[PDB]
Amino acid sequence: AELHLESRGGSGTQLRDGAKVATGRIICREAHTGFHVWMNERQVDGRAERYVVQSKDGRHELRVRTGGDGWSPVKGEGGKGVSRPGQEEQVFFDVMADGNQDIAPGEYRFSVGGACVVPQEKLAAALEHHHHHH
Amino acid sequence: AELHLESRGGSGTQLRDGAKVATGRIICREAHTGFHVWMNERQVDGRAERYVVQSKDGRHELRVRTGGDGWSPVKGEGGKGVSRPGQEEQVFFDVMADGNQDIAPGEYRFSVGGACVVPQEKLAAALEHHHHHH
Ligand SMILES: [Cl-]
């Protein structure tokens, strides 16, 4: 499982809701059933996938969300980010401005995590069955 | 994950193809997406589900396959036995005669393995990203 991110839209202008601040992909090598991406950032308002990130100096905020085609917020206690089903090798996601905003000039630094959902096995005790054919 | 097996009888020494030698069940209490059953026995003809087992005395062989409704041979290099999707607590499987055979009365032993298929997240290394906003 591996992430890539490429930067988008960093001009000194208003950010529009949905503006891509970064575009990413997650790649999986093993048989898998789906994907999970999140930010290692403060979640806002009890949301799984809506975050506030901070400038390099710690003094300024930008509200963002993770999403894109096929991505759904992860439900339930402890949920983070978004999930998407699929067995294909790679899918794309975006980090987007969440609501129209004016933010302070600076370098904004954030952390993205991800995973591939891989079937694993929990084994039973092997059973040696003696069959009486008679 | 837990296995149980019970021998199944018939009307003589000829075991026709598909005749049951045993029926088992695999029980999975933890949240799971499916089931996997196999034998820890010699495989026949490079096929995941086909096995040959030994009598106690008399140097007799018995050829069997694992299967039953809802089970499919596991595909891929090193595939063992059969798999079946489902989230329910338990499913049944059969051990069946594989090909018509004339089998001497005796004890025939075979080791059955099983597992519950439980999704786990395989983590990517996290990525730091720097967004410069002017
Ligand atoms: Cl929205």
TrEMBL record, chains A, B:
The gene that this protein is the product of is draD
Key words of the record: Signal
In Swiss-Prot or TrEMBL terms, this protein is called: AfaD
Q: Where is this region: Disordered?
A: 65-85
Indicate whether Signal appears among the record's keywords. Answer: yes
